[PDB]
Design an enzyme around this catalytic site. Structure first.
Site, short mmCIF file in Angstrom:
data_model
loop_
_atom_site.label_atom_id
_atom_site.label_comp_id
_atom_site.label_asym_id
_atom_site.label_seq_id
_atom_site.Cartn_x
_atom_site.Cartn_y
_atom_site.Cartn_z
N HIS B 20 33.89 38.55 39.67
CA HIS B 20 35.12 38.51 40.52
C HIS B 20 36.29 37.87 39.75
CE1 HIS B 20 32.09 38.38 44.10
NE2 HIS B 20 32.19 39.60 43.58
N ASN B 272 41.88 12.63 41.90
CA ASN B 272 41.02 13.70 41.33
C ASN B 272 41.89 14.69 40.53
OD1 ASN B 272 38.68 15.10 40.68
ND2 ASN B 272 38.33 15.92 42.73
N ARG B 275 42.64 13.08 37.39
CA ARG B 275 41.32 12.96 36.70
C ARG B 275 40.94 14.27 36.00
NH1 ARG B 275 36.31 10.85 39.95
NH2 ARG B 275 35.41 10.27 37.94
N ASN B 278 44.02 18.38 32.33
CA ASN B 278 44.34 18.03 30.92
C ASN B 278 43.56 16.76 30.54
OD1 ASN B 278 45.48 18.32 28.38
ND2 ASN B 278 47.51 17.61 28.98
N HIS B 282 44.47 12.61 29.48
CA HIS B 282 43.95 11.72 30.55
C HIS B 282 42.96 10.71 29.95
CE1 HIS B 282 41.63 10.17 33.89
NE2 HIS B 282 40.55 10.77 33.38
N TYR B 290 44.92 1.95 30.50
CA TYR B 290 44.29 1.41 31.74
C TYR B 290 43.25 0.36 31.32
CZ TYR B 290 41.50 1.15 36.04
OH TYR B 290 40.79 0.71 37.13
N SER B 313 53.21 7.79 31.32
CA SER B 313 53.09 9.24 31.64
C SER B 313 54.44 9.80 32.11
CB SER B 313 52.01 9.48 32.67
OG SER B 313 51.92 10.86 32.99
N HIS B 317 57.03 12.47 29.36
CA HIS B 317 57.39 13.86 29.77
C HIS B 317 58.91 14.03 29.81
CE1 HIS B 317 53.24 13.97 30.26
NE2 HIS B 317 53.13 13.86 31.59
C1 LIG Z 1 51.76 19.32 34.60
C2 LIG Z 1 52.16 17.83 34.89
C3 LIG Z 1 53.06 17.76 36.16
C4 LIG Z 1 50.96 16.88 34.94
C5 LIG Z 1 50.23 16.74 36.13
C6 LIG Z 1 49.11 15.85 36.19
C7 LIG Z 1 48.72 15.11 35.07
C8 LIG Z 1 49.42 15.24 33.88
C9 LIG Z 1 48.91 14.38 32.65
C10 LIG Z 1 48.88 12.84 32.95
C11 LIG Z 1 47.58 14.90 32.15
C12 LIG Z 1 50.55 16.14 33.81
N1 LIG Z 1 51.32 16.29 32.54
C13 LIG Z 1 50.74 16.90 31.31
O1 LIG Z 1 49.60 17.28 31.28
N2 LIG Z 1 51.64 16.99 30.11
C14 LIG Z 1 51.19 17.57 28.83
C15 LIG Z 1 51.30 19.12 28.82
C16 LIG Z 1 52.46 19.64 29.74
C17 LIG Z 1 52.22 20.51 30.82
C18 LIG Z 1 53.29 20.97 31.61
C19 LIG Z 1 54.58 20.56 31.33
N3 LIG Z 1 55.65 21.06 32.18
C20 LIG Z 1 55.74 20.59 33.55
C21 LIG Z 1 56.56 22.04 31.62
C22 LIG Z 1 54.84 19.70 30.27
C23 LIG Z 1 53.77 19.24 29.47
C24 LIG Z 1 49.79 19.81 29.12
C25 LIG Z 1 49.84 21.10 28.65
C26 LIG Z 1 51.08 21.11 27.62
C27 LIG Z 1 51.48 19.56 27.53
C1 LIG Z 2 45.63 33.40 55.77
C2 LIG Z 2 46.88 34.08 55.23
C3 LIG Z 2 47.76 33.09 54.47
C4 LIG Z 2 46.51 35.27 54.35
C5 LIG Z 2 45.63 34.83 53.18
C6 LIG Z 2 45.18 36.03 52.36
C7 LIG Z 2 44.15 35.62 51.31
C8 LIG Z 2 43.57 34.25 51.63
C9 LIG Z 2 43.05 36.67 51.19
C10 LIG Z 2 43.55 38.07 51.54
C11 LIG Z 2 43.05 39.02 50.45
C12 LIG Z 2 42.05 38.19 49.65
C13 LIG Z 2 41.88 38.52 48.18
C14 LIG Z 2 41.58 39.99 47.95
C15 LIG Z 2 40.54 40.17 46.87
C16 LIG Z 2 40.42 39.29 45.86
C17 LIG Z 2 40.04 39.75 44.48
C18 LIG Z 2 38.88 38.90 43.97
O1 LIG Z 2 38.63 39.22 42.60
C19 LIG Z 2 39.25 37.42 44.09
C20 LIG Z 2 39.51 37.03 45.54
C21 LIG Z 2 40.67 37.82 46.11
C22 LIG Z 2 41.97 37.42 45.43
C23 LIG Z 2 40.79 37.62 47.62
C24 LIG Z 2 40.98 36.13 47.96
C25 LIG Z 2 41.35 35.87 49.42
C26 LIG Z 2 42.52 36.77 49.77
C27 LIG Z 2 43.66 36.52 48.79
C1 LIG Z 3 51.53 13.95 26.93
C2 LIG Z 3 52.27 14.85 25.96
C3 LIG Z 3 51.40 16.03 25.57
C4 LIG Z 3 50.94 15.97 24.11
C5 LIG Z 3 50.13 17.21 23.76
C6 LIG Z 3 48.80 16.84 23.10
C7 LIG Z 3 47.92 18.07 22.93
C8 LIG Z 3 46.44 17.73 22.81
C9 LIG Z 3 46.26 17.04 21.48
C10 LIG Z 3 45.47 17.42 20.48
C11 LIG Z 3 44.56 18.63 20.45
C12 LIG Z 3 45.20 19.71 19.57
C13 LIG Z 3 44.29 20.17 18.43
C14 LIG Z 3 44.54 21.59 17.95
C15 LIG Z 3 45.95 21.83 17.42
C16 LIG Z 3 46.07 22.05 15.91
C17 LIG Z 3 47.33 22.86 15.60
C18 LIG Z 3 48.21 22.33 14.48
O1 LIG Z 3 47.87 21.32 13.83
O2 LIG Z 3 49.27 22.94 14.25
#
Ligand SMILES: CC(C)c1cccc(C(C)C)c1NC(=O)NCC1(c2ccc(N(C)C)cc2)CCCC1
Ligand SMILES: CC(C)CCC[C@@H](C)[C@H]1CC[C@H]2[C@@H]3CC=C4C[C@@H](O)CC[C@]4(C)[C@H]3CC[C@]12C
Ligand SMILES: CCCCCCCC/C=C\CCCCCCCC(=O)O
Ligand SMILES: CC(C)c1cccc(C(C)C)c1NC(=O)NCC1(c2ccc(N(C)C)cc2)CCCC1
Ligand SMILES: CC(C)c1cccc(C(C)C)c1NC(=O)NCC1(c2ccc(N(C)C)cc2)CCCC1
Ligand SMILES: CC(C)c1cccc(C(C)C)c1NC(=O)NCC1(c2ccc(N(C)C)cc2)CCCC1
Ligand SMILES: CC(C)CCC[C@@H](C)[C@H]1CC[C@H]2[C@@H]3CC=C4C[C@@H](O)CC[C@]4(C)[C@H]3CC[C@]12C
Ligand SMILES: CC(C)CCC[C@@H](C)[C@H]1CC[C@H]2[C@@H]3CC=C4C[C@@H](O)CC[C@]4(C)[C@H]3CC[C@]12C
Ligand SMILES: CC(C)CCC[C@@H](C)[C@H]1CC[C@H]2[C@@H]3CC=C4C[C@@H](O)CC[C@]4(C)[C@H]3CC[C@]12C
Ligand SMILES: CC(C)CCC[C@@H](C)[C@H]1CC[C@H]2[C@@H]3CC=C4C[C@@H](O)CC[C@]4(C)[C@H]3CC[C@]12C
Ligand SMILES: CC(C)CCC[C@@H](C)[C@H]1CC[C@H]2[C@@H]3CC=C4C[C@@H](O)CC[C@]4(C)[C@H]3CC[C@]12C
Ligand SMILES: CC(C)CCC[C@@H](C)[C@H]1CC[C@H]2[C@@H]3CC=C4C[C@@H](O)CC[C@]4(C)[C@H]3CC[C@]12C
Ligand SMILES: CC(C)CCC[C@@H](C)[C@H]1CC[C@H]2[C@@H]3CC=C4C[C@@H](O)CC[C@]4(C)[C@H]3CC[C@]12C
Ligand SMILES: CCCCCCCC/C=C\CCCCCCCC(=O)O
Ligand SMILES: CCCCCCCC/C=C\CCCCCCCC(=O)O
Ligand SMILES: CCCCCCCC/C=C\CCCCCCCC(=O)O
Lengths: 375, 375, 375, 375
Positions: B20, B272, B275, B278, B282, B290, B313, B317
C-alpha cells in the site's frame, strides 16, 4: 459461476486499525480543519453554504417524488411475478412499472427546473431501482419455469447494499450503533469537504470563462490547476459512498459480505481496476450482462460479449451526467473510450494513476466551462 | 545514559516493502509525471530551470570554498587533541579552527553576493562540521583526563550519517550499490519535485506583492493558498535528506543503525514529535546540551536545563534562515516559540498536523513576501 | 605475457632510508630554504604568489567541470558493458561517453579563456579517464565472449594508481596516515619549489623577448641559461607526481605493488629508459598498443608495431602541451623524434643525461618565447 | 691519545662502487658535457681559456721558486735535529729555515706582480711545509731528551698525504697505476669544471660592479645568484683536492690509511663537521695545538684551550685569502666567527647546509666585488 456470499469485512475497515492509516485519516481531517479555520477567518471580515442551500433547492419535492417511485418499484415487480407464478396481466404491470420511473423522474427533473444535487438524488435512485428490480426479476424467473419468493426478503433486498438478489444474505450477530453513528458522521464530514473543494478551489478559478477567445492557455493550465479538485472529488466519492455510506447500511441491516471494494489502488492490470472498484455494480454488470451475453450469443469469442458491458457502463454514466447538469455533449463517453483504449490494451501502476489524475482534471474543467456557458 | 548502537533498519525502508506504501509512493511519482507533462506542454508553446541555474549561481566557488573548511575541520581537532594528549599550543589551534569556519563561510556568503541555494550548501556544512567536531572533542577529552583515538575512525566518523562519535559504529557485511543508485536517483527526483513546486505554486502567486496596501486579504488567503507548497516543501525535505540521502551514505559507508527517524507521523505527545523527527541532530542535542546541562547545573529542576536545548534549537534555525536569504527579522523564532507553547503545554494527533500545516503556510508566505520586498 | 602484481615497495622509498640519500634530500630542502629566505628579504624591500593566483585562475570552475566528466567515466562504461553482457544500445552509450569528455574539457578550456595550470588539471584528467576507461573495457570484454565485473572493484580501480584493470590488486594490511601526511606535505613543497623556479630563474630572463631581431645570441645562451630550470622542472615532476603523489594514493587505498618507477637514472640502454620511467603509463601503453598491435598485425616484424607506441606517445604529449598553453606548433614532437633517433639507434649513460639536459633546455626556452610572443 | 694508523679505504671510494653514486657521478659529468657543448657552440660564432692562461701567468717562475723552498724544508730541519741529537748552531739553522720560506714566497708573490692561481700554489706550499716541518720537529724532539730518525722516512713523510709524522706508515702491497691515472684525469676534469664555473656563472654577473651606488638590490640578489657557483666551488675543492688528488698520491706512495674525510655530509653536530671535514689538517691541528694547549696550560677548562685551535684556523685561512688576491679586509674571519657562533652553540642537519650555502654565497660575491674594485 454466480457469486456466493461469505462473512469477510470491508478491506479498508480492517486496514483502518493499522496505525499509519489512522495517521493519514487524521492528516485529511487536519486538511478539513485548515479549510474551516481559514474560510471562517476570511469570510468573517457568511460561509460557502451558498452551494448547499442552492444545490439542495427543492430537496423536499425531491424526497416527496422519490417516495412514489420507491412504492412502485417495491409493489409492481413482486405482484407481477406472484400472479405470473400462478400459471396473466403481469406483462403489462411490470412494463407500466418500467414507465412510471422512466418518465416521472425526468418530468419532475426538467419541468420543475431542479438544481443539480436534488437532480442527482432522483437519477441515482431511478438507475438503482431499475438495476435491482431487474436483478430480482432475472433471479426469480428461472425458479418459476418448472413444467414464490418470500416478500420480507425482497423488501430487505431493496435496502441491502448489494445488487445481486440471493434471499439468503449471510448476516452478523448484532448492530454496533456506535460504529454506524461514526460512519454517518464521516459521510456528512465528506459532503462538507466536497462542498469546501467545489466552493473554494473549483468555482473561483472557473467563474471567469466569459473572458475566453478560444485560447488554449486558459484551458490546459486551468485543467492542470483543476486536476487536484478532480482527484479529491473522485476519492471523496469513493470514501463517502463506498466505505462511509454502504458500510453504515451493511451495519444497520446486519448484512455480512461487506466487500464493496477490494484494493483498487493496487491494480497493476486495468482489468483488475474494473474488477476491484465499486464491486457491487461490477457484480451486477458481470452477472446480468457478461455471463448472460455469453449465454445468449453462445459466443466462444467474448470480443463482442465484452464491449457490451463497457458500452452499457459508458452510456449509463453519460446519461447520469447529461441528466444531472442538463448537458447534451458527452465528454466522459469519449474520455471513457480513449482511457479504456489506452489502459486496457496500450511499476506500470503509475500510468493508471497519471491517466486517472487527468481522467479527473478533464471532467471537472470541461464541465465547469459549460455549467457557466449555459448560465 | 549515553546512546548505544544496534543494527535496526530505517523504519520507512522495511515499511516501503508493504504494498500500500509502494502505491502511495507511485501516486506521488504520478503527481511529478503530471507536473512534467503539463509544464512541458504549456511552456513548449523553456522549463522553470530558471530557478536551478539561478539558485546554483556560484556552485563552483561554493564547493571550492567548502574544500578548505573540510580540510581544517578534519586536521585541526585531531592534531590539537593529539598533542594535548601528550601531557601545549592546542588551545590556540582549536580556537583558530573555530574562527576559520565561523568567518570564512560568512565572508564568502556576503562579500561575493551568493544566491540562496549555494549559500544554504555552505551554512549547512559549517553547522554540520561545528556540531560533529565539538561532538568528537567532548567524547575524546574525558578519556585523556587519567592522572589516542584512531585517526581512520575520525575521518570515517566525519562522513558517518550520525553526530555521536563512538569509533565502534557496528557495520553491515557489504554494499548494495543498486540500492544506493536508487536512493540518489530518488534524492535528485525529490530536488526536481521541490524545484517544480517553488517554480509553479509558490512564486507566481507571490511575485505580485508590489501591489499591496497592507491589506489582510492578500496575506491570509495567500497563506492558505501557500499552505500546500509549505507541507510538500517540509515532507520532501524529510524524504530527500533523511531517507534518500542519509540512507544512501549509511549504505556506501557500510554503517548499521539507520534509525535517523522513528514514526514522527504517529506522535501523539509533542515531546514524542521532538524525540522521533531527525533523530541524528536530536541525539547530538540531547547528549551534548540536555545531559551536560543536567550535569553542569546539577539541577533536579530540568525547567531551566530544558528550554536551553529549545533556545539553541530556536537560534540555530533562525541563524540558518537569516543567513540563507539575508533576512534580519526572525519569524520561525516567534513561530517556533508560539508553536512550542501551543503543542507542548496547551485523536489529539490532528491538532499537531493542523498547527504544522499553518506552521508551513506561515513560513513560506512571510518569506516569499520579504524575498521580493528586498528585490 | 600480461602484467602480474606483487607486494614490492617503491624503490626510492626503501632507498630513502639509506642515510646519504636523506643528506641529498636535506640538501634540496636547504636549497628551498635559501630561495624562501632570499625572496622574502628581497621582495620585503609581496611574494611571487603572482603565478599561483594567476595560473589557478578559475580552479573552482575547473574542479566543478571535472565532477561531471568523473561521474560520466564512472557510470557510462560499467552500464554499457553490463547490458552488453546480457546477450543493445551500449554501442551508442560508450560513444556518447567518448564524446562527453572529448568536447566538454576543450569547450570549457577555450570558450572560457582558462589559465595554463587549471587547463593542465582538466587535460590530464581527460587523458587519464580515457586511458583507464578503455583499459577496463578491453580487459572485461574478452571475459564476455563465451558462447559481470564487481562494481566496487571498478570504482576502486578508477582511483587506483595503476592503469591496468585486474580487480584483484593485492593489498597491504593497514594505512600509515603519518606517511601519507608526509607525502602530501612533500608534494605541496615540490609545487612551491617549482613555483619559485618558474617565478625567479625562468620568467625574468625570458620576459624580454620583445627585444629580439631573430639573433642566435639571445636563443642559444638563453637555452643554456634555462637548461637548469628545465632539469629541476622535469626532476620535480618525477618526485612530486611519481613518488610524493602516487605513493600517497597507493597508501590511502591500501594498494600494494608501488613500482611506478624502477631506477631510470641507471638506464644504460635507452629501451631501459622507456622501460623504467613512469612504469604505470608504460605498462598501459605496452599491454594495450604493443601486445595488441603484435596480435592485430600478427607481425613477426615489430618494426611497424613499435613506432606505433612511439607515435601515440609522441602525439599524446604534443596534444597536452598544444592544449595547455594554446600553441599550434609542435617542438617536443620534432625534439621527441630527434632524441628518439639519437639515443635509440645512434659509461655511455652520460650521453643520455646530456641529451636530456638540452632535452629540457630546449622545451622551456622555445615555449617561454611563444608564451610571451602570444602575450 | 696520539693517532694510530690502520688500513681503511677512503669512504667515497668504497662508496663509489654502489651504483646510484656512479649515476650521480655520471649526472655531474653530463653537467660538464653540457657546459663544453654550449660554450663551444656559442663562442664558435675562442674558449674561456682567458682565465687558465691569465691565472697561470708566471707558473714557470712559481715552480722554479717552489724548488728552493722544498730543498730548504727538506734539508734544514733534519740537519738541525741530527746535530742537536749529538749532545750546537741548529737553533740558528731552523730559525734561518723558518725565515727562508716566510719572506721568499711573499717577496716573489708581491715584488713580481703574480696572478692569483700561481700565487695560491706557493702560499699553499709554504703553509704545507711549515705545518709538516714543525710536525716532524715536535715528534722527533721528545725522543732526543733521554739523559736519530731515518732520513728516507723523512723525505717519504714530506710527500705522504698526512701531516702527522710516524715513520711507520702502514703500506699496501702494490700500485694500481690505472687507478692513479683515473684519479689525476678526474682532478684535471675538476679544474676544467671550476674554470667553466668562474668563467661563465661568476664573472659575467660581477664584471658590472662599476655601476653601483651602494644599493642593497645588486648585493643581496647578486649574493643569491652567486650561492650556486659558491657551493660548486667548495664541493669541487672537496672532490678534486681530498678524493682525486690526495688518494692519487696515497696510491703512488703505497700509503695505507686513506681516511682524509669521513662522512661530513652526515654531520648533525657542528663539532662532527670540524671532526670529519679535511681530517689530515684537523689531525695536525688537534694533535699539535689542542692536545699541546691542554698540556701547556694544564687546564681542566678547555674553554681557552679550544678557541685557540679555532683562532689559528681563522687567521690561517684569512692569511691565505688576503695573500692570494692581495685583500687587506678579512670577511671569512668575521663570517668564520659568525658561522662558528651560530652552528657551534645556537633533521637539524638542514641549518648547517643552509648556513653553508650562504657561507659560500657571501665569500664569492664580497670577493668578486673587491677583485674588480681593485681593477
Ligand atoms: C522541521 C522543524 C520545524 C523541526 C521540528 C522538530 C524538531 C526539529 C529538530 C530539533 C530535530 C526541527 N528542525 C530540524 O530538524 N532542522 C534541521 C533540518 C531542517 C528541516 C526543515 C527546515 N525548514 C523548516 C525549512 C529547516 C531545517 C532537518 C532536515 C534538513 C535540516
Ligand atoms: C473524514 C474526511 C476528512 C475524509 C477523509 C478521507 C480519507 C481519510 C480517506 C478517503 C480515501 C482514503 C484513501 C484512499 C486510498 C488510499 C491509497 C492507499 O495506498 C493508502 C491509503 C489511502 C490514501 C486511503 C487513506 C484514507 C483515505 C484518504
Ligand atoms: C540543526 C541544523 C541542521 C544541520 C544538518 C546536519 C545534517 C546531519 C549531519 C550529518 C550527516 C551527514 C553525512 C552525509 C553527508 C556527506 C556529504 C558531504 O560531505 O558533502
Ligand atoms: C469512477 C469511474 C470512472 C469508474 C471506473 C471504473 C469502473 C466503474 C464501474 C464500472 C464500477 C466506474 N464508474 C462507477 O463506479 N459509477 C458509479 C458511481 C460513480 C463514481 C464516480 C462518478 N464520477 C466520475 C463523478 C460517477 C459515478 C460509484 C460511486 C457513485 C456512483
Ligand atoms: C618525460 C618524457 C620526455 C618521457 C620520457 C620517457 C618516457 C615517457 C613515457 C612514455 C612514460 C615520457 N613522458 C611521460 O611520462 N609523460 C607523462 C608525464 C609527463 C612528464 C613530463 C612532461 N614534460 C616534459 C613537461 C610531461 C608529462 C609523467 C609525469 C607527469 C605526466
Ligand atoms: C671549507 C672551510 C670553511 C672549513 C670548514 C671546516 C673545517 C676546516 C678545517 C679546520 C679543516 C675548513 N677549512 C679548510 O679545510 N681549509 C683548507 C682547504 C680549503 C678549503 C676551502 C677553502 N675555501 C673556503 C675557498 C680554503 C681552503 C681544504 C681543501 C683546500 C685547503
Ligand atoms: C458538494 C456539493 C455539490 C454537495 C453534493 C451533494 C450530492 C452530490 C451528494 C451528497 C449526498 C449524496 C447522496 C446520498 C446518498 C444517496 C442514496 C443512494 O441510494 C443514491 C446516491 C445518493 C443520492 C447520493 C448521491 C450523491 C449525493 C446526492
Ligand atoms: C520520489 C518522489 C516523487 C518523492 C516521493 C515522496 C513520497 C513517495 C514519500 C515522501 C514522504 C513520504 C510520506 C511521509 C509519511 C507518511 C505518513 C504515513 O502515515 C503514511 C506514509 C507517508 C504518507 C509517507 C509515504 C511516502 C512519502 C509520501
Ligand atoms: C528547489 C530549489 C530551491 C533547489 C534547492 C537546492 C537546495 C536547497 C538543496 C538541494 C540539495 C540539498 C543539499 C544536498 C546535501 C547536503 C549535504 C549535507 O551535508 C548538508 C545539506 C546539503 C547541502 C543539502 C541542503 C539542501 C540542498 C542544498
Ligand atoms: C622536498 C622538496 C625540497 C623536493 C626535494 C627533491 C629531492 C629530495 C628528490 C627529488 C628527485 C630525487 C633525485 C632523483 C634521482 C636521483 C639520482 C640518484 O642517482 C641519486 C638520488 C637522486 C639525486 C634523487 C635524490 C632525491 C631527489 C633529489
Ligand atoms: C609551478 C606552477 C606553474 C604550479 C603548477 C601547477 C600544476 C602544473 C601542477 C600542480 C598540481 C599538479 C596536479 C595535481 C595532481 C593531478 C591529478 C592527476 O590525476 C592528474 C595530474 C594533476 C592534475 C597534476 C598536474 C600538474 C599540476 C596541476
Ligand atoms: C668528475 C667531475 C665532473 C666532478 C664530479 C664531482 C662529483 C662526481 C662528486 C664531487 C663531490 C661529490 C658529492 C659530495 C657529497 C655527496 C653528498 C652525499 O649525500 C651524496 C653523494 C654526494 C652528492 C657526492 C657525489 C659525488 C660528487 C658529486
Ligand atoms: C678555476 C681556476 C681559477 C683554476 C684554479 C687553479 C688553482 C686555484 C688550483 C688548480 C690546481 C690546484 C693546486 C694543485 C695541487 C696543489 C699541491 C698542494 O700541495 C697544495 C695545493 C695545490 C697548489 C693546489 C691549490 C689549488 C690549485 C692551484
Ligand atoms: C452505475 C450507476 C451507479 C448507481 C449507484 C448504485 C449504488 C449501489 C446500489 C445500492 C446500494 C445502496 C443501498 C443503501 C441506500 C439506501 C438509501 C435510501 O434508500 O435512501
Ligand atoms: C601520457 C599522459 C599522462 C597521463 C597521466 C596519467 C597519470 C597516472 C594515472 C593514474 C593514477 C592516478 C591516481 C591518483 C589520482 C587521483 C586524483 C583525482 O582523482 O583527482
Ligand atoms: C689549512 C691550510 C691548508 C693547507 C693545505 C695542506 C694540504 C694537505 C697537506 C699535505 C698532503 C699533500 C701531499 C701531496 C702533494 C704533493 C704535491 C707536490 O709536492 O707538488
Amino acid at each position: 459461476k454466480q457469486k456466493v456470499f461469505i462473512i469477510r469485512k470491508s478491506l479498508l475497515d480492517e486496514l483502518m486499525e493499522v496505525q499509519h492509516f489512522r495517521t493519514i485519516y487524521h492528516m485529511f481531517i487536519a486538511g478539513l480543519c485548515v479549510f474551516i479555520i481559514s474560510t471562517l477567518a476570511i469570510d468573517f471580515i457568511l460561509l460557502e453554504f451558498d452551494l448547499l442551500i442552492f444545490s439542495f433547492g427543492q430537496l423536499p419535492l425531491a424526497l416527496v417524488t422519490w417516495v412514489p417511485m420507491f412504492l412502485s418499484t417495491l409493489l409492481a415487480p413482486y405482484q407481477a411475478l406472484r400472479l405470473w407464478a400462478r400459471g396473466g396481466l403481469g406483462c403489462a404491470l411490470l412494463a407500466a412499472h418500467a414507465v412510471v420511473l422512466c418518465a416521472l423522474p425526468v418530468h419532475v427533473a426538467v419541468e420543475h427546473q431542479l438544481p443539480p444535487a436534488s437532480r442527482c438524488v432522483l437519477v441515482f435512485e431511478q438507475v438503482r431501482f431499475l438495476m435491482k428490480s431487474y436483478s430480482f426479476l432475472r433471479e426469480a424467473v428461472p425458479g418459476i419455469l418448472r413444467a414464490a419468493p418470500s416478500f420480507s426478503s425482497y423488501l430487505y433486498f431493496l435496502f441491502c447494499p448489494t445488487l445481486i438478489y440471493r434471499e439468503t444474505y449471510p448476516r452478523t450477530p448484532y448492530v454496533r450503533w456506535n460504529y454506524v453513528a461514526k460512519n454517518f458522521a464521516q459521510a456528512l464530514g465528506c459532503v462538507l469537504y466536497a462542498c469546501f473543494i467545489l466552493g473554494r478551489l473549483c468555482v473561483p478559478v472557473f467563474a471567469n470563462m466569459s473572458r475566453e477567445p478560444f485560447s488554449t492557455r486558459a484551458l490546459v493550465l486551468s485543467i492542470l490547476h483543476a486536476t487536484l479538485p478532480g482527484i479529491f472529488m473522485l476519492l471523496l466519492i469513493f470514501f463517502a459512498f463506498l466505505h462511509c455510506w454502504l458500510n453504515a447500511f451493511a451495519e444497520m441491516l446486519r448484512f455480512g459480505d461487506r466487500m464493496f471494494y477490494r484494493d483498487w489502488w493496487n491494480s497493476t492490470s486495468f482489468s483488475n481496476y474494473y474488477r476491484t472498484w465499486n464491486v457491487v455494480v461490477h457484480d451486477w454488470l458481470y452477472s446480468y450482462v457478461y455471463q448472460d451475453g455469453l449465454r445468449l450469443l453462445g459466443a466462444r469469442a467474448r470480443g463482442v460479449a465484452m464491449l457490451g458491458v463497457f458500452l452499457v457502463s459508458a452510456v449509463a454514466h453519460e446519461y447520469i451526467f447529461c441528466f444531472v447538469l442538463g448537458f447534451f455533449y458527452p465528454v466522459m463517453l469519449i474520455l471513457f473510450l480513449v482511457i479504456g483504449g489506452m489502459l486496457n490494451f496500450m511499476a506500470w501502476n503509475v500510468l493508471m494513476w497519471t491517466m486517472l489524475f487527468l481522467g479527473q482534471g478533464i471532467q471537472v474543467s470541461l464541465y465547469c466551462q459549460e455549467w457557466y456557458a449555459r448560465r
